[PDB]
Amino acid sequence: EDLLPFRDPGFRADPYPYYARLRQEHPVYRHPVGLYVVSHYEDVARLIRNPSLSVQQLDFGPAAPIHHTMLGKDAPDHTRLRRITNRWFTPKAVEEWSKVMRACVEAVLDEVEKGDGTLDAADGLSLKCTFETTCHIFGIEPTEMDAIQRKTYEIGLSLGPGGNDEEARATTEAFAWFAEHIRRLVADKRARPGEGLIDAFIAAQDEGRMTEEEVVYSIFLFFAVGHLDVKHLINHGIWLMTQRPELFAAYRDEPEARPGIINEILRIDTPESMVVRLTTQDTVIGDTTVPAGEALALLIASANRDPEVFADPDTFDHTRPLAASQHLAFGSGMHGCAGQVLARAEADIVFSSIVNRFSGVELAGEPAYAHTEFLRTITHLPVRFR
Numbered sequence: 290e291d292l293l294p295f296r297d298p299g300f301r302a303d304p305y306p307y308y309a310r311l312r313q314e315h316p317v318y319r320h321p322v323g324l325y326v327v328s329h330y331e332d333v334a335r336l337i338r339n340p341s342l343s344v345q346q347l348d349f350g351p352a353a354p355i356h357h358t359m360l361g362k363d364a365p366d367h368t369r370l371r372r373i374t375n376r377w378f379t380p381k382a383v384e385e386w387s388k389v390m391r392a393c394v395e396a397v398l399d400e401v402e403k404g405d406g407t408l409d410a411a412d413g414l415s416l417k418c419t420f421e422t423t424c425h426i427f428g429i430e431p432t433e434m435d436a437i438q439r440k441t442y443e444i445g446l447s448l449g450p451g452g453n454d455e456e457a458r459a460t461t462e463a464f465a466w467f468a469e470h471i472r473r474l475v476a477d478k479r480a481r482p483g484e485g486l487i488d489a490f491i492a493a494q495d496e497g498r499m500t501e502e503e504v505v506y507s508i509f510l511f512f513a514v515g516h517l518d519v520k521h522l523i524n525h526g527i528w529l530m531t532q533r534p535e536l537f538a539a540y541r542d543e544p545e546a547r548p549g550i551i552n553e554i555l556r557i558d559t560p561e562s563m564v565v566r567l568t569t570q571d572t573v574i575g576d577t578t579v580p581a582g583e584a585l586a587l588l589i590a591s592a593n594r595d596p597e598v599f600a601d602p603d604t605f606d607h608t609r610p611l612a613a614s615q616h617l618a619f620g621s622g623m624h625g626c627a628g629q630v631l632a633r634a635e636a637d638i639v640f641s642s643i644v645n646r647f648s649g650v651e652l653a654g655e656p657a658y659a660h661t662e663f664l665r666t667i668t669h670l671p672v673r674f675r
């Protein structure tokens with residue numbers, strides 16, 4: 290705990306002042322859990338691109354199956370796996386996915402506009418539409434959305450460095466649920482092939498480029514990333530529009546401002562706080578040398594609030610230089626988000642659909658949260674459109 294008390298409710302609600310104290314006093318902090326925590330932008334940016342840091346040799350504990358996915362592999366296995374999916378998430382591919390996302394979003398807003406204008410924008414929009422888009426990509430009908438959201442969040446608790454024993458058991462149970470669910474999806478597609486990403490994983494398996502477990506857990510990974518951080522971008526952006534009507538107006542009236550707005554939502558409340566790596570050689574980080582064999586937590590959320598890069602960093606300003614494009618919310622280096630183009634498209638579709646159809650959005654109740662040391666989480670976001 291000490292300077293980063295992961296399970297403390299105050300820290301989870303607002304960790305930014307804790308990051309600021311670390312940046313000032315301990316840029317490389319040896320945390321009691323056995324992590325070296327790295328809080329400055331300059332150091333995070335260099336390390337996340339350093340090819341000597343490993344994910345494959347990290348102990349993921351109950352989340353070990355992530356080692357059967359690109360997220361849990363070092364090169365060359367990383368390259369092998371990532372090359373299978375690269376063509377599915379290019380700007381060209383995203384043009385197709387955008388039509389699906391747009392239709393889903395527009396259908397939700399049609400129900401809203403025909404009713405009383407109220408919506409839980411979390412379960413009823415950001416989750417629903419990102420999940421349905423992911424299922425279209427895979428080539429399946431949408432089912433088990435609630436379980437998939439819940440069990441992804443459960444796994445997230447163990448990926449956070451504050452995870453405990455009870456959370457670990459729920460995590461292994463979640464992976465068993467996912468593997469059973471996904472094996473049925475794959476069996477169905479072997480029996481009746483389509484043209485979706487699941488079909489592409491099956492083809493890769495049949496060509497000897499992936500194992501059966503790599504197929505199953507890679508589908509898991511895309512279920513999780515297809516909705517988890519992107520729904521926070523959407524949720525937090527909608528919440529900001531309820532608080533800041535000038536942001537609603539700018540999104541609608543200034544198309545050139547839109548990347549800057551997306552970027553500033555991501556910078557101010559980074560959906561995933563950190564990425565973890567293992568050193569494989571003595572690693573110099575400023576005035577500290579970390580031995581080989583040590584786990585590093587690269588605090589992207591702290592980097593994103595570092596005043597050496599972002600002036601007045603705790604203030605939301607969508608008009609920042611270079612559209613706030615220096616943020617590290619999508620990571621960087623070998624593992625830099627494979628879904629960035631899709632995520633930015635999905636968020637843009639939601640925000641543009643809202644501001645082109647309604648005059649404003651307001652809160653219709655108190656939001657609910659489930660923040661952790663690792664994940665920012667809006668669980669319920671009751672709004673009214675007009």
Ligand code: HEM
Nearest residue numbers: 359360514518519522564618619620623624626627628632
């Ligand atoms: C705002 C939304 C998102 C944010 C902030 C985000 C952030 C990140 C970050 C920080 C990582 C790096 C993890 C590391 O270095 O350990 C990552 C990896 C990845 N993300 Fe995203 N992500 C988002 C949306 C998506 C979406 C919609 C997809 C869907 C394809 C996706 C797919 C991935 C994949 C597959 C990886 C692993 C890449 C690799 O290991 O080479 N992400 N994401």
Ligand SMILES: [Mg+2]
Nearest residue numbers: 392395396399
């Ligand atoms: Mg329509």
